[PDB]
Amino acid sequence: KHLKRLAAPHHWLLDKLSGCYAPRPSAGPHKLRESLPLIVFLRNRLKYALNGREVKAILMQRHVKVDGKVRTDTTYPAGFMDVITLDATNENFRLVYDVKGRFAVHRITDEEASYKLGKVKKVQLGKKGVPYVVTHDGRTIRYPDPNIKVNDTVKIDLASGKITDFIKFDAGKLVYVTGGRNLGRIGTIVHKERHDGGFDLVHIKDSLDNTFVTRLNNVFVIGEQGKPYISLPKGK
Amino acid sequence: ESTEEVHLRKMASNLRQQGLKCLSSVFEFVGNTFDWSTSMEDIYAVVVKPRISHFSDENLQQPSSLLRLFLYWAHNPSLYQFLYYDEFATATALMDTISNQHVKEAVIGPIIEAADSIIRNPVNDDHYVDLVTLICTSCLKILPSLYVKLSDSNSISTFLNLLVSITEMGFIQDDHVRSRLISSLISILKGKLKKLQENDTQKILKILKLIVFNYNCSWSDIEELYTTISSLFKTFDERNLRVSLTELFIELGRKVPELESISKLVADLNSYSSSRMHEYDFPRILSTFKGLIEDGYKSYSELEWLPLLFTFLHFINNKEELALRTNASHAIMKFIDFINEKPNLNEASKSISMLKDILLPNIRIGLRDSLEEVQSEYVSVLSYMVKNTKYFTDFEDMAILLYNGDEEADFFTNVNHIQLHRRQRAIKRLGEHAHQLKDNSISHYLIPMIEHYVFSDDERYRNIGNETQIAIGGLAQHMSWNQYKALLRRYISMLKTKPNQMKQAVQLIVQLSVPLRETLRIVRDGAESKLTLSKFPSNLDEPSNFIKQELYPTLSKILGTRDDETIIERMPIAEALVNIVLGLTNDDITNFLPSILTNICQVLRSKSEELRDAVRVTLGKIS
Amino acid sequence: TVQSERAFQKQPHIFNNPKVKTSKRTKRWYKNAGLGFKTPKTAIEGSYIDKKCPFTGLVSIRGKILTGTVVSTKMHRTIVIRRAYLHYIPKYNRYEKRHKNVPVHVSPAFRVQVGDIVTVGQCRPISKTVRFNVVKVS
RNA sequence: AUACAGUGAAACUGCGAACUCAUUAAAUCAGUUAUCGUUUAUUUGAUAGUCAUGGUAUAACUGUGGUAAUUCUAGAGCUAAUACAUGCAAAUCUCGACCCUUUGGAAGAGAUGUAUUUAUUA
């Protein structure tokens, strides 16, 4: 199960001179390709811990809380729209992709860190006739707003796991793309169409009026036009 | 009353419920096999006597085991002694529960069914007679409060069966109960075909006829019931229902002397032929029409008109016999002639109000009807009434459109002419006559005719529809702005309904939006001359803020309708959207013009060359 | 004849009650295939029973949608369509046409002759070599 | 430590234990789908009302022995479980007449695990 340093993904931005073997992300909320391990986050990125032993010491000492709860696994997968709380420093980070296509932290405040946006991949009726939604991180949230459909974004309180607000998939809404050649791009969508012998294709317009087309499962509605619910890094 | 042991109380309650439902289930499952007579008194003393005092309040919410046992006792003839104990105490409790404010009709229904079964099944006992009389009195008291409360069609049918059984018994002889039953029957007749089944309606009519035969009726109540029966005979297409209404009219004529003559005329009109089943007598109908054309229309009273007016409307709506339709049109013309020959303005206005209540919506329905013969008969009747009567404004407008009765000048005469070229001349003449026709008259009359001409499937008739669409766009200015908005909503509904009609709807939308654009531009400019749209709102802000805020969702729907066939229709829709933008305020036009421009750009962005050329022609017209 | 085979041919989990006479001859179940393809009236009032039919069977259309010209209709409830796609050979320096044959299941609702352009859609493997089912016939 | 309580051999239990030789050109491989056609130890998020405490069978351990002898053995004696086997009507709701009295208290009438296989009904 040993993953090579060259075989490590480009999203992590590791230093190749560091070691022979890259960390392998554990099973968890996000898939292995778009995950970012906590050891990579703390050691190679935040430079807090110099080596994996004191990375394990930190994650023992429970300063690092991921999405509210406390994780002690060194290779715990932390992914897109994940809030990491370092309680000793009182600094909160939100993981967002860079425009070039790599992971990046964002310094966020406390009341921003209190909520998290998730893409509703499933809407279904569970047992005893209880509706539920399955978000992109794997969360199952009971009793949603009946207006919530597939590919809509829900703002989730971290303390309770409850949906406060939601954004509907609609033309002229600021979405974010999370896959493919277009990865790391922020833009409002022109439209959505069906591709013959293919899938739903979404046409998105950037700030500089450039048009780029991607898969339906790749998009992520971060907010409506002119009001992003989350903070965004400099450079748009 | 020891409340110290809630466990004991719950155990006692559970034992009571299980024991009662067990006794009920024993009663239906064993049936009429066990000799119940030996344990009858013991059972009634034990389980019925304490709960009998509060059974009426207890079982109001939902059916219960004790209530089901009572219903099975009422159904089984051998179990009648259970009810007969204590002078119909259980029956009185059930009747009180029915009479009280029950939570649901699901408890009211089976009690009425059991009462009907007990009435239908006779028993030879003095207690049986007393219980039957008490149940009949309770049902007669409860019936006006039960007919309204009954929300189920099966429950209404059961109530009608119980009323028929009560009428067969003849329990009530008072005229007040007859008046209450007549009011209930009128309320039942005021309904729908989905609400009341045809067999159920026939049974209700038979019960009403039996009640009318049993009870004497005053003149005013007989006239009200005759008007209701006339409306019912107009509504009922079934000849069995027509025969039932004829029997009811015969009963009303037995009740009242002038109603005897009226019902004799109605029965002569609606007399069924013996040779053809469920078919009226053509020679008798022709003789009645010949009498009504010359001697009848002077003889018939104002109240007596309404049954024959309903019969004539039904005959005109019926497409079975064109001769009968012509006879009905002649009868309507004779009624209009009687209204004109009445010297009093109030006497003419009574018939005018009767026509506006009945005959004018009937003519509107005939114009909207797809039946060409019925539409032509309605148009001919309208023209004859326009010639006969000088009072009525749409009649004056129709005379102005007739223009001294020339065949080419008259829109109706050239339409009745078989020549499509004459129809085109009529449409072109009506386009100029829209400047003189009334707005309400145009909206009531020419719009169904123009819609029929547009929806006609022939190619020459499609040219007629295009000319009528141009005339309708011209007359939309001559029409009221509310009528224009209603016509736009109807066109949007037709576009949503049929794609083939949508292209014609798109053309009509453009040809109505261009006068709308001109009127809105004149309102924005504040021109001293009156706007094109007749009776337009004084505030230019309100009409624009209604029309544009309605048309922008329509423009969005047209843009979202991204179909290749719809794109041709969307091009006239794009022209209408450009007209709406031009009619809007200039700053609002400057804001909304990026949206229409982007829609036109998406239309022209098609890779197909022929679609691009068509969109280019449309965009050239739009520019 | 719908009952030609030795086993009884019925739509699964559809029960018409012998106690109650029905105005329809048999209860029949039809499903909207999706992708904007209308359910044909032959499938609506057909008497045929087919598992592999996208409108009246358990087979659902998902994946790709293709178009092709019908070549052979000899085999039962299956057709062979030919798709001609232009190919570039660098050594020849010129575009050269190539064809691929796709054996496609045909529902009995559609009647296809040789040389008719048909629209097909991907489904679960119908047989050893069949993965495509017709959904629109032009 | 007058049940054990520190640290703990053995044992029971639980988890992990998924180099050589032969040469295929729609095969392999590379992408690309599909799984409304499938399986899950783990991770993560959900999820379960429908006796102050049951009976054993053994290991390690005692002992008596057989074999030239193996991580081979038989006889008798011991006692533990997150081993194996066994096993428990109330409460919550809806319709609540009527009462006052509006929030309200209540005559009463009724309802109520999960899994497996199939048939039937939305």
Side-chain angles (χ1 to χ4, degrees), chain A residues 1-14 18-180 182-191 194-204 212-236, chain B residues 7-8 10 12 15-23 26-31 34-36 43-48 50 54-55 63 66-67 70-74 77 80-85 89 91 93 106-111 114-115 122 127 144 159 170 191 215 219 253 257 267 283 291 296-297 300 305 307-308 323 328 331 343 348 361 366 390-393 395 399 405 409 426 431 434 436 444 448 452 464-465 471 473-474 476 478 481 486 499 505 515 526-527 537 543 553 560 572 574 576 583 594 614 620, chain C residues 1-20 26-37 39-73 75-88 90 93 95-96 98-99 101-110 112 114-135 137-138:
Chain A
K1 313 184 179 185
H2 288 241
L3 170 74
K4 213 166 183 186
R5 180 78 55 166
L6 60 85
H10 177 235
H11 313 117
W12 298 353
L13 202 50
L14 295 175
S18 296
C20 183
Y21 292 165
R24 198 195 187 247
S26 166
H30 297 68
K31 286 188 152 182
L32 192 139
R33 283 71 41 81
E34 69 275 16
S35 46
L36 182 88
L38 285 195
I39 178 166
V40 165
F41 169 74
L42 286 173
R43 175 187 61 179
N44 291 42
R45 290 294 189 91
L46 264 289
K47 312 284 194 169
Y48 272 56
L50 304 181
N51 52 356
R53 189 199 93 265
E54 65 183 1
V55 177
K56 186 49 161 171
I58 291 181
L59 293 158
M60 190 166 137
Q61 274 313 329
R62 299 195 167 185
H63 313 308
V64 181
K65 318 197 311 174
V66 186
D67 291 77
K69 313 191 179 178
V70 176
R71 312 298 181 183
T72 61
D73 192 60
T74 43
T75 53
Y76 175 79
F80 183 63
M81 217 47 66
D82 283 3
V83 170
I84 315 174
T85 292
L86 275 70
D87 203 3
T89 313
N90 303 146
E91 278 281 279
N92 299 294
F93 303 89
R94 184 167 308 248
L95 289 171
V96 285
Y97 274 122
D98 202 4
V99 177
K100 292 176 71 68
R102 294 181 304 283
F103 264 105
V105 304
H106 196 300
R107 276 179 164 175
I108 61 179
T109 73
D110 292 331
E111 81 295 357
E112 206 182 0
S114 57
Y115 62 88
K116 159 180 179 178
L117 274 75
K119 181 181 180 181
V120 180
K121 292 172 164 169
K122 291 183 177 182
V123 184
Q124 200 62 255
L125 200 66
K127 292 183 183 293
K128 305 302 185 58
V130 171
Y132 71 100
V133 296
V134 171
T135 61
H136 78 303
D137 51 2
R139 286 190 178 187
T140 301
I141 305 164
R142 319 196 80 190
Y143 294 112
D145 195 1
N147 297 115
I148 300 177
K149 285 310 153 207
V150 182
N151 302 345
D152 297 354
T153 312
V154 286
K155 168 171 150 184
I156 318 164
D157 182 74
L158 274 300
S160 44
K162 291 177 183 179
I163 301 174
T164 77
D165 313 294
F166 79 114
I167 313 152
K168 189 142 302 181
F169 203 70
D170 175 54
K173 291 220 185 168
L174 193 65
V175 311
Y176 184 76
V177 59
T178 64
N182 295 13
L183 174 62
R185 220 158 168 182
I186 311 171
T188 186
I189 62 163
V190 176
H191 67 107
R194 181 67 178 171
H195 174 240
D196 46 349
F199 291 162
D200 293 2
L201 275 168
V202 180
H203 300 233
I204 314 170
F212 63 92
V213 185
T214 193
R215 283 270 310 101
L216 179 61
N217 61 6
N218 267 6
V219 302
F220 189 72
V221 185
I222 46 173
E224 61 86 20
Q225 173 44 289
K227 203 56 64 196
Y229 283 71
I230 60 178
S231 63
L232 281 192
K234 182 240 191 172
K236 215 187 179 179
Chain B
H7 162 68
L8 185 72
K10 290 157 188 173
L15 176 59
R16 171 163 150 239
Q17 298 142 1
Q18 296 299 290
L20 286 201
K21 83 169 184 63
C22 165
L23 191 43
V26 161
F27 262 87
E28 69 263 10
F29 286 143
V30 170
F34 184 68
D35 172 355
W36 289 106
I43 285 176
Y44 156 72
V46 171
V47 298
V48 189
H54 298 87
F55 167 68
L66 189 71
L67 167 73
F70 287 174
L71 297 166
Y72 172 67
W73 293 350
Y80 281 167
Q81 46 159 1
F82 299 153
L83 296 175
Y84 294 164
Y85 301 143
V107 70
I108 311 177
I111 304 176
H127 294 88
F159 156 73
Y215 302 93
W219 167 267
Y297 85 105
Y300 298 149
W305 280 353
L308 188 153
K390 64 182 181 293
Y391 295 97
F392 183 75
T393 67
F395 286 174
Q436 293 92 20
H444 292 350
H452 180 74
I464 301 299
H478 296 121
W481 74 282
Chain C
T1 289
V2 287
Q3 302 307 307
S4 66
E5 310 279 356
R6 310 155 51 73
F8 191 78
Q9 311 291 118
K10 76 159 202 171
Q11 264 193 305
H13 307 268
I14 287 183
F15 174 55
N16 62 186
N17 186 19
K19 277 193 167 182
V20 176
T26 318
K27 291 174 70 175
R28 188 169 185 86
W29 163 90
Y30 63 91
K31 51 166 284 191
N32 190 11
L35 277 296
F37 293 101
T39 313
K41 274 312 211 203
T42 46
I44 297 298
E45 293 83 3
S47 296
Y48 77 102
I49 300 296
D50 187 19
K51 302 189 297 181
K52 324 285 212 315
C53 178
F55 322 113
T56 51
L58 294 174
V59 161
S60 296
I61 292 305
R62 81 285 177 276
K64 293 187 287 185
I65 318 294
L66 283 72
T67 55
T69 63
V70 168
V71 172
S72 169
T73 57
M75 51 205 308
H76 186 27
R77 287 150 174 258
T78 315
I79 60 182
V80 181
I81 67 168
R82 159 190 273 241
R83 290 171 51 252
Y85 74 110
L86 277 296
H87 181 74
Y88 171 67
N93 290 318
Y95 292 165
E96 202 274 332
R98 295 293 87 194
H99 67 89
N101 287 350
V102 179
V104 172
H105 190 284
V106 55
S107 166
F110 293 141
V112 289
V114 174
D116 291 331
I117 297 89
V118 287
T119 305
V120 306
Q122 192 158 100
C123 62
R124 66 167 176 76
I126 305 304
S127 78
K128 174 189 183 185
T129 77
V130 176
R131 285 93 174 92
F132 281 105
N133 209 343
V134 290
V135 73
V137 171
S138 178

